[PDB]
């Protein structure tokens, strides 16, 4: 399937991904997409920020959902 995540910066990604992806699945598939670390990503989907443990399954995200990628910089 096929999830997009879209920017603050305003540009949308695209993602193929798995119904039982982890949230730590996504943050790789960004960095090997946009070169940002995981541990650097914040993920928020229907205004829920999402844990790198569960899954895409668990929070209900089904084919072109969208997701917003959040940049933590410490
Ligand atoms: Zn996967
Ligand atoms: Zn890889
Ligand atoms: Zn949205």
């Known amino acids: 399937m096929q999830i ?30 946009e070169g940002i670390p995981p541990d650097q990503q914040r993920l928020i989907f229907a205004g829920k920020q999402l844990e790198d443990g569960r899954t895409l399954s668990d929070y209900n995200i089904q084919k072109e959902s969208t997701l917003h990628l959040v940049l933590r910089l410490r």
């Open 4 to 33: 997009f995540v879209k920017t603050l910066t305003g540009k949308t990604i695209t993602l193929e991904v798995e119904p039982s992806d982890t949230i730590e699945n996504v943050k790789a598939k960004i960095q090997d997409k």
